[PDB]
Amino acid sequence: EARDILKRPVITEKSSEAMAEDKYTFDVDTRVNKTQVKMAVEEIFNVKVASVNIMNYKPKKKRMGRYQGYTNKRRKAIVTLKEGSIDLF
Amino acid sequence: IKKYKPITNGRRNMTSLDFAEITKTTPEKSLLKPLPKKAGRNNQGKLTVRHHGGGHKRQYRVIDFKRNKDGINAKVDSIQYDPNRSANIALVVYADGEKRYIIAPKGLEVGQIVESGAEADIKVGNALPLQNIPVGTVVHNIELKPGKGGQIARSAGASAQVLGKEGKYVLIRLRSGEVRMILSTCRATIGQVGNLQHELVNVGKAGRSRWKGIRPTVRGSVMNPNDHPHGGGEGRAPIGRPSPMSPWGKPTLGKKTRRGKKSSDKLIV
Amino acid sequence: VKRTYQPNKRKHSKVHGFRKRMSTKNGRKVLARRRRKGRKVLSA
RNA sequence: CUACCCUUGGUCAGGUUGAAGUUCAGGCUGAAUGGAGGACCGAACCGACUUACGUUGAAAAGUGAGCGGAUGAACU
RNA sequence: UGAGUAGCGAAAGACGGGUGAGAAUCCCGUCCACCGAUUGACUAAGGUUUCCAGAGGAAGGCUCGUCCGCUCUGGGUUAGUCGGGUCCUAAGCUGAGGCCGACAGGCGUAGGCGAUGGAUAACAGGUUGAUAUUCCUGUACCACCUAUAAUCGUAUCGAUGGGGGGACGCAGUAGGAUAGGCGAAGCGUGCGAUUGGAUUGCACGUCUAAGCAGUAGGCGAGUAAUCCGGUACUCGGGCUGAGCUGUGAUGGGGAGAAGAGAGUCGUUGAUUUCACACUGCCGAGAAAAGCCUCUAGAUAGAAUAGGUGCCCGUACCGCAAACCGACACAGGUAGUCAAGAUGAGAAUUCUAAGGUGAGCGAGCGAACUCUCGUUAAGGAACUCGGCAAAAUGACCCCGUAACUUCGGGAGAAGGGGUGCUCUUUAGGGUUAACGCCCAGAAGAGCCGCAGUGAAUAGGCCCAAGCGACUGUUUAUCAAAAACACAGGUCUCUGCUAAACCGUAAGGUGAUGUAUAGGGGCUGACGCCUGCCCGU
RNA sequence: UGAUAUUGAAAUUCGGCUUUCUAACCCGCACCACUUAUCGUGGUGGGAGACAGUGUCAAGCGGGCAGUUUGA
Numbered sequence A: 001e002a003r004d005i006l007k008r009p010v011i012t013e014k015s016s017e018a019m020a021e022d023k024y025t026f027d028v029d030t031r032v033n034k035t036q037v038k039m040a041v042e043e044i045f046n047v048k049v050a051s052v053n054i055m056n057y058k059p060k061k062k063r064m065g066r067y068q069g070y071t072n073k074r075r076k077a078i079v080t081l082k083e084g085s086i087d088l089f
Numbered sequence B: 001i002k003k004y005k006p007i008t009n010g011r012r013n014m015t016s017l018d019f020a021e022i023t024k025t026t027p028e029k030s031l032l033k034p035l036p037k038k039a040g041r042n043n044q045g046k047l048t049v050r051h052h053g054g055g056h057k058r059q060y061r062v063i064d065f066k067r068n069k070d071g072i073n074a075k076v077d078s079i080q081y082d083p084n085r086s087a088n089i090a091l092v093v094y095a096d097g098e099k100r101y102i103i104a105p106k107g108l109e110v111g112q113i114v115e116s117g118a119e120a121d122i123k124v125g126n127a128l129p130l131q132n133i134p135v136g137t138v139v140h141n142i143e144l145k146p147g148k149g150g151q152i153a154r155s156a157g158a159s160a161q162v163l164g165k166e167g168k169y170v171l172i173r174l175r176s177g178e179v180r181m182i183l184s185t186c187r188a189t190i191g192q193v194g195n196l197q198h199e200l201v202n203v204g205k206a207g208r209s210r211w212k213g214i215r216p217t218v219r220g221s222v223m224n225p226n227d228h229p230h231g232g233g234e235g236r237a238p239i240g241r242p243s244p245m246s247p248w249g250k251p252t253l254g255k256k257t258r259r260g261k262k263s264s265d266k267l268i269v
Numbered sequence C: 001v002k003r004t005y006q007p008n009k010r011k012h013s014k015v016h017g018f019r020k021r022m023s024t025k026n027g028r029k030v031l032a033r034r035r036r037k038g039r040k041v042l043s044a
Numbered sequence D: 001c002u003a004c005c006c007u008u009g010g011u012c013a014g015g016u017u018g019a020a021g022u023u024c025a026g027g028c029u030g031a032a033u034g035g036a037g038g039a040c041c042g043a044a045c046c047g048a049c050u051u052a053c054g055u056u057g058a059a060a061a062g063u064g065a066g067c068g069g070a071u072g073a074a075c076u
Numbered sequence E: 001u002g003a004g005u006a007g008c009g010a011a012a013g014a015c016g017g018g019u020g021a022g023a024a025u026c027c028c029g030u031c032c033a034c035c036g037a038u039u040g041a042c043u044a045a046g047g048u049u050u051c052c053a054g055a056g057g058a059a060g061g062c063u064c065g066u067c068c069g070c071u072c073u074g075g076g077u078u079a080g081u082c083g084g085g086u087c088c089u090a091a092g093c094u095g096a097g098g099c100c101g102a103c104a105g106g107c108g109u110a111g112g113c114g115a116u117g118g119a120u121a122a123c124a125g126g127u128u129g130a131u132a133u134u135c136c137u138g139u140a141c142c143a144c145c146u147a148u149a150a151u152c153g154u155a156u157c158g159a160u161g162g163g164g165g166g167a168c169g170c171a172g173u174a175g176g177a178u179a180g181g182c183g184a185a186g187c188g189u190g191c192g193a194u195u196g197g198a199u200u201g202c203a204c205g206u207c208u209a210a211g212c213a214g215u216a217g218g219c220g221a222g223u224a225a226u227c228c229g230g231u232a233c234u235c236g237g238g239c240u241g242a243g244c245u246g247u248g249a250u251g252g253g254g255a256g257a258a259g260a261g262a263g264u265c266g267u268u269g270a271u272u273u274c275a276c277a278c279u280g281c282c283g284a285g286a287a288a289a290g291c292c293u294c295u296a297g298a299u300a301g302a303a304u305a306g307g308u309g310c311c312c313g314u315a316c317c318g319c320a321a322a323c324c325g326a327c328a329c330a331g332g333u334a335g336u337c338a339a340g341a342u343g344a345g346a347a348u349u350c351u352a353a354g355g356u357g358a359g360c361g362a363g364c365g366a367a368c369u370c371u372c373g374u375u376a377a378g379g380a381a382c383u384c385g386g387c388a389a390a391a392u393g394a395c396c397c398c399g400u401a402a403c404u405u406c407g408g409g410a411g412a413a414g415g416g417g418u419g420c421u422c423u424u425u426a427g428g429g430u431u432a433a434c435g436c437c438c439a440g441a442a443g444a445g446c447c448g449c450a451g452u453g454a455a456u457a458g459g460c461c462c463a464a465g466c467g468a469c470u471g472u473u474u475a476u477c478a479a480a481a482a483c484a485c486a487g488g489u490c491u492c493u494g495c496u497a498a499a500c501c502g503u504a505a506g507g508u509g510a511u512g513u514a515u516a517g518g519g520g521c522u523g524a525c526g527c528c529u530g531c532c533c534g535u
Numbered sequence F: 001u002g003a004u005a006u007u008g009a010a011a012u013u014c015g016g017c018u019u020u021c022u023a024a025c026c027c028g029c030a031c032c033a034c035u036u037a038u039c040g041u042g043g044u045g046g047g048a049g050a051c052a053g054u055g056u057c058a059a060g061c062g063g064g065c066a067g068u069u070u071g072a
C-alpha cells in the first residue's frame, strides 16, 4: 500500500539543510518508484508533488566482535514539494 | 600485367595485374551485400584442414550463376572486380529493370546483348541449354545438374570443349583435360572466362599472401616425430621411410584418392 | 610482469556462475556436491 | 596467463628519401607536378642483442646503460 | 643458535610557531628542492566504504607517532534530457518443431540473447565538511497526455512487406574554419632604499547550449498488391549536406586587485580538433534498427497553456599505499587532456597549470664491493674475444669508391663553417603601407682555450662464411647458420572434390569449382641441375 | 575387396556372366505447400537405379593409434 512505501523520516545535518530549503529526506522500501513515493507523500501528508529524488545504498559493514557482517541495504529518497509543509519535532 | 620497379629490396620482383579491364565503377553494386565472416575453423571450432586464416575483409558477391531468369534481353552496366572469385565479373541489368552480377568472359564490351534460355544465340555472352550449342563450342560454366547453377568451369581464366554428343548427356572436355558426359539439360555459358593472365602475377612480398587468407606453412621435415612422420632426426634429414608422407600418415607423392565404387564412375572416361 | 588472473566480472559469472553451472548436467552435479558438503557459498 | 583464430574498436611526435602515373624541351634522356614502399633516421609503443648490478633479491625472470622494430607478417 | 647480526624497498630538506604525558616523523608558516607528454587533470576495468567530520593509539605502519588507506561514533552517492535498461544487430551463445544419437546427449531451421559498434532530446554558472550535465540560479529540448482547433468527411496512421538511406578499407597532399599560443598603445596595482632607472614593474584581455540569420562538399516529364523503387525514348543555373562566424541568450553570469561598487581591443602565428570529404592505391573494405518512402490494410479529426516522464550506475582509489603481483612491493595496467622558453618534434634542458619531498634516522668520511668523474707517458701491449669504457653525433655547404639485380651501395669515406655586435639588404605571406610574423645573403668589428661553449642527436673502412631480404622462435640459461617467406617443382583432387574434425548428423574446404583446393620437397634472383629401374 | 539381407521385373552367352525397364532404395537440385524461414515433412518434375548406402560375416592394407617384450 502507501503506508508501507514510506519507511522512516531521516534526520541528519544534510536532511536539515533539506528541510531548510523545502526538501524532506525519506527512507523508503526497495523496488518502490519515485512515483509511489510521491503518491505516498500525498496520501500520507496532504501536500503534493514537485521533485521526488531517489538513490540506493549498498549494505555497509560492521563488526560486533568475531562476527563482522553487513547491514541492510538502504533506499533513501528525499522529496520536495510544490506546496505543503510536513514536520513533527 | 604491370612490372614493379625494384625500389624496395623486399618484393623487388613484384607484379600487379594491370586492372584497366576493371574500368567502369570501382565500387560494388549494393545488390550483393550479406556475408561472409571469415572462418578457417569448422563448426565446433576445431581447426579442420587449414593453413588458412587472417586476411582482408570481403563482402560477398551474389552472382547469378544459375541464369534461371532466362528470357528477357540484358546489357552490361559495368565490368567491376570480384575479390571472392579470381575473375572480375560484369554487372548486367534486365529489361525488367532487375540487375544481376554475372561472370565476365574475355572480351565483352561495356554494352552487350545475349540473354539466357531457349534461344540459340551461340556467340559469346550468357548461357544457353544444353544439348544445344555447336559441338566444338568455346563453352564454359557447365552444370552437373539441371538448374543447379553451373558447378564446373569458373575461376579466372577457364575453358571447356563442347566436342561430342552421346545422347541423354553431351560430352565435354574440362580444362583439366578430363572428358566426360555432362547431362544435356545443363546451362553452359559461351566464351573463355575472366582474366587471361591471373596466373602470371607473382606475389612478390611475403604477407601479400597474408593479405589473402594464407597462413605460412611449416614443412613436415622439420618439427618433431610426434608431430609428423617426417619429424625428428639430427640436422637436415632424409625422408627416411619410402614414399613421402602427409601428416596423419598415408603416402602423398602419387597415391590416388578417388573413391572406390563412385556413383559417377559410369558417366566419365 | 602480468600475472595470471586479470579479473572481469562478466567472465567470472560466465563459466563459473549459477546459470552456467545449471546449464550442463555436470554443473548440476557440481552444485549437488558443493551443496552436499554444505558450502556457505555455492557458485559465484 | 599463454598459442592460433573469429567479430568489434583504438594507437603510431617529428624529420627523410622520391616508385608509378601526368606534364614542357627528347628518336626509351634532363626539369616540374606527383606521393609509392613488409623504404630510411628517430620518441610514443612493442621488443629483448650486450653488459654490469641484483642472486635468504625492490622482483619466483627485474633494474641502469647502450640495443632491435617502429605504415606494418605493426602494436592492443 | 646464528645476533643485537643482515635488513628497514630508488628520492632533499632546514628552521620557526602550535599541539601534546611524550615529537626528526602530526598541524601551521617561510625558504629550499623534485616531476612537469607528468610524480599533473579526467575517466574505463578492477576493487567495494578505502570517501567525510569528530574523537582514539593496544595491534596494523619495516623507526616514531599527537598521525593514517588503522580504531570507535556519527554521516555521506539526488538525472526525462550523461553510461546502461524500456531501441538495433556482429562474432559467438542459445536453438520451438526438426536430423542424429548405448544412455548421458551432439548438431540445427524459425526465432531469441549478445556491444567492443549503429541510433539516442541541455547547457552555463553557483554551492558543501563529504555529491553534482543529477542539488538550484538562469536559459532550453525530447516524448506523451489533457484542454482550445484556421484546414478534411464510403484529410490523418501507415505496415513486423518490397524501396531509399543508415553503410564504412588503406595511404597522401593542399585548403576553409576553429580551440590553445605569442606581443602591444584600454584596463585593474605598485613606484622600489643595494650603484642605476621611471612609455617602469607584474598581473588580465571571457561567456554555453539550444534559436534566429548565411557560409570548402556532393550530385524532370511518361509508360510496363503500389503513385515509390529499378529499366528507356523526345525535349537547355538548384535538390542534399555543412565546419564556423554575426545576432539574440545578457541590463545575466563571470571576473582583477583592496581602501572601508570594474576590462572585453588589436595584430600575429595555428593544430594530431572539424571531412573517408577530396585525391590516389588494391589486398576490393559488417549487420540490423532508428529515419525517409511507396502502398497492403486501418481509423469519426489530425503554434497557445497546464500537466506526465520509470529501473540500474553515481561515494573514493584508478601509472596506484585502495587494481593484478602473499607486502603501504623499483614490475604489470585501455583511453582522454596535454601550456612556456629552446627546437623539425609528443626529442633535449629548465619552468606553467598542478603535484611531491617518497614511513627510520644521527654521525664518521677506514678496508672491500657498488654507481659516478678525472688521470702523466704509452695506446689493445689486456683478453677466448676491444667485453666494458672511450671516441662519433645537430644544422648549412662542399665532396663521395669497388660493386650493382641500376633501385642501390650513401650519413660511404671524408672536407669547411657555426658565438656576439654593427651596418648597408634582400626574398617569402598577412594587411589601405604602416608592423606582425620567418630568414636568408654581404661587409666590417668584438671576445674566449674552446661558439650546436649546457642537455639531448651515426664511429667508420677492408675482407671471408651462413641466410636472399622485412618478419618468427625456445615466457623463466640458445634470436641463430634454425622456422617463415615470394619463387620453383612433384603429387592428389570433376565437386555430396580430394584433404580434414565428429564418422552421427552437422561442418571446414568454399557460399570455392583445375589460372582452383589439399599434401610433399626446395626456398629471392642469376647460371644450371647430369649417371643408375630393390622398395 | 567378396559372399549376403535390404532386393524387384524381363531379355543373352553356361544358379553365375552382360544389358533394359521401375514399384524398392538415393539426390549436398528444380519447383509447390506447411512457413513472414537454404533445417526438416510431404507433393510433384526430372536424376540414378536393384548396383550405390546400410547391418552381418569374410580376406587384405594399416606405428595413424594402443599394450608390451627387447636375458644373465
Ligand SMILES: [Mg+2]
Pocket: none
Ligand atoms: Mg548529449
Ligand SMILES: [Mg+2]
Pocket: none
Ligand atoms: Mg540486447
Ligand SMILES: [Mg+2]
Pocket: E038, E319
Ligand atoms: Mg600519469
Ligand SMILES: [Mg+2]
Pocket: E328, E359
Ligand atoms: Mg612506503
Ligand SMILES: [Mg+2]
Pocket: none
Ligand atoms: Mg618555436
Ligand SMILES: [Mg+2]
Pocket: none
Ligand atoms: Mg611529509
Ligand SMILES: [Mg+2]
Pocket: none
Ligand atoms: Mg647514513
Ligand SMILES: [Mg+2]
Pocket: none
Ligand atoms: Mg673524458
Ligand SMILES: [Mg+2]
Pocket: none
Ligand atoms: Mg675465435
Ligand SMILES: [Mg+2]
Pocket: E398
Ligand atoms: Mg652537394
Ligand SMILES: [Mg+2]
Pocket: E410
Ligand atoms: Mg648521400
Ligand SMILES: [Mg+2]
Pocket: none
Ligand atoms: Mg674457415
Ligand SMILES: [Mg+2]
Pocket: none
Ligand atoms: Mg617473444
Ligand SMILES: [Mg+2]
Pocket: none
Ligand atoms: Mg558429410
Ligand SMILES: [Mn+2]
Pocket: A054, A055
Ligand atoms: Mn538515480
Ligand SMILES: [Mn+2]
Pocket: B222, B223, B224
Ligand atoms: Mn626442430
